[PDB]
Structures are given as C-alpha cells and as structure tokens.
Amino acid sequence: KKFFVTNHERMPFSKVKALCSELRGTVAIPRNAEENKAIQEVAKTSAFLGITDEVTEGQFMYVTGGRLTYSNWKKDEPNDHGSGEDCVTIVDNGLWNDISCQASHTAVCEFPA
Amino acid sequence: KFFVTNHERMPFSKVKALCSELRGTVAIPRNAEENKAIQEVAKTSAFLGITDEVTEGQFMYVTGGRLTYSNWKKDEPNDHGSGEDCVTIVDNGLWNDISCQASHTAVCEFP
Numbered sequence: 266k267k268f269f270v271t272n273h274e275r276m277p278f279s280k281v282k283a284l285c286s287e288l289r290g291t292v293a294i295p296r297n298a299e300e301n302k303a304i305q306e307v308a309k310t311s312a313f314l315g316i317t318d319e320v321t322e323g324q325f326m327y328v329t330g331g332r333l334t335y336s337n338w339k340k341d342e343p344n345d346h347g348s349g350e351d352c353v354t355i356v357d358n359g360l361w362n363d364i365s366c367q368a369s370h371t372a373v374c375e376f377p378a
Numbered sequence: 379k380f381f382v383t384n385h386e387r388m389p390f391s392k393v394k395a396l397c398s399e400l401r402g403t404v405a406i407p408r409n410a411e412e413n414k415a416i417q418e419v420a421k422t423s424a425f426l427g428i429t430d431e432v433t434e435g436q437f438m439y440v441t442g443g444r445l446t447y448s449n450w451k452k453d454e455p456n457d458h459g460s461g462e463d464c465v466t467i468v469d470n471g472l473w474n475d476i477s478c479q480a481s482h483t484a485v486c487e488f489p
C-alpha cells in the first residue's frame with residue numbers, strides 16, 4: 266500500500282519535506298511495525314520520519330495531519346533534549362529518537378500504492 | 379533530475395511497473411553526470427530505461443528516441459547467448475546489455 270524511496274542524501278528536515286513534495290510524495294511515516302522495518306531497510310542509516318511536535322510541544326503529529334498513533338520510541342525518548350528536539354528520526358534497530366529538525370538525516374519519501 | 383531507489387532487485391518488467399506506479403520513469407542517464415548520479419544511488423547493478431527490444435542492436439529509451447549518450451563496457455553490447463535486450467549500469471558506471479529477465483536494482487527518475 267506504500268512504497269518508500271530514497272536518493273540516500275542527508276539533509277535537514279525542511280529540505281526533506283521540500284524534496285518529497287517535489288517528487289509528489291510525502292515524508293515517510295510508518296503506520297505500523299512492518300512499514301517501520303521497510304523504512305529502516307530502505308534508508309539503511311538514520312532517517313527523518315514525517316512526524317513532529319513543532320505545533321504543541323510533546324504532541325507528535327504527522328506532517329499530513331493527525332496525532333501520532335503507532336510509535337517505536339527508543340527508551341527514554343522522546344526527550345526534547347538540549348535546546349529542543351521537534352523532529353523524529355528512525356535510528357539503529359528501527360527505534361525512534363526525537364532530534365533537532367536542523368540535524369541532517371536521510372531523506373525517505375513515501376508514495377501510496 | 380532526481381534518482382530514487384527502494385533498493386529492490388527485480389526483472390525489468392517489474393522496474394517499469396514500479397516507476398510508473400510512482401509516476402516516474404526508469405532511470406535514464408543522458409550524460410556522464412547523470413550516469414555517475416545513478417551509479418551512486420544504486421550502489422550495485424541497476425537497470426536503465428534503455429532497451430533494443432524493438433529492433434535488435436538499436437537501443438532506444440523506453441520513453442522514445444534513439445540512444446545518444448552511452449557508456450558501454452568494451453565489447454558490449456553483445457546480445458549474449460539467447461539474447462540481451464536490457465541495459466544495466468554496473469558497479470563502476472560502465473554498461474552491459476543483459477537479459478530483461480535478470481534481476482537488478484530499480485532506480486526511477488523524476489523531473
């Protein structure tokens with residue numbers, strides 16, 4: 266029902282959103298453990314997910330709308346560490362960590378099948 | 379152009395179907411720059427949107443038109459054995475014609 270693609274480049278979240286929109290897709294969002302693994306497999310390295318709590322701190326929402334349903338946070342995450350972390354990356358083992366949206370991570374876009 | 383991959387390896391027929399589902403086309407390098415860019419995204423052998431399925435020895439883009447830029451490996455294309463009508467960019471950027479039924483990495487392009 267979804268295809269996940271990457272050009273392997275690492276960039277800040279704003280650039281990922283721009284890239285995926287230009288391809289007419291959206292930033293990858295895993296709706297379950299299966300999709301999560303798929304994203305991990307495609308990215309191979311840390312990648313941003315289309316999820317942020319930029320609107321209301323602590324309330325993670327999908328960039329396409331709606332409150333986060335499925336999640337796979339790494340232990341003790343999200344932690345809004347340091348000056349603040351409003352973006353989400355799928356790290357090693359497919360676990361999630363909230364991180365600065367200014368950090369550079371692999372762009373993965375999704376397309377509806 | 380943007381070149382994207384999901385890393386899966388499949389026969390050419392499936393690569394075409396895949397890129398069309400994404401509303402893109404199979405990757406086609408129009409120059410050395412694009413050829414290197416596809417090489418870097420695929421990181422392994424990948425199919426290019428170029429075949430001589432219509433007329434043997436006359437490679438054409440799947441989107442129409444005769445092949446302009448090429449980067450064949452020495453002694454290629456050789457339509458080896460029973461036949462080879464597809465084109466793969468290999469690990470070093472060079473090209474080899476190969477069976478369309480062989481499985482290689484899917485790389486799609488978007489304008």
Ligand SMILES: [Ca+2]
Nearest residue numbers: 318322349351
């Ligand atoms: Ca915040």
Ligand SMILES: [Ca+2]
Nearest residue numbers: 318345350351
């Ligand atoms: Ca936050």
Ligand SMILES: [Ca+2]
Nearest residue numbers: 344346362363
């Ligand atoms: Ca964190």
Ligand SMILES: [Ca+2]
Nearest residue numbers: 430434461463
């Ligand atoms: Ca032939």
Ligand SMILES: [Ca+2]
Nearest residue numbers: 430457462463
């Ligand atoms: Ca041939």
Ligand SMILES: [Ca+2]
Nearest residue numbers: 456458474475
């Ligand atoms: Ca050959």
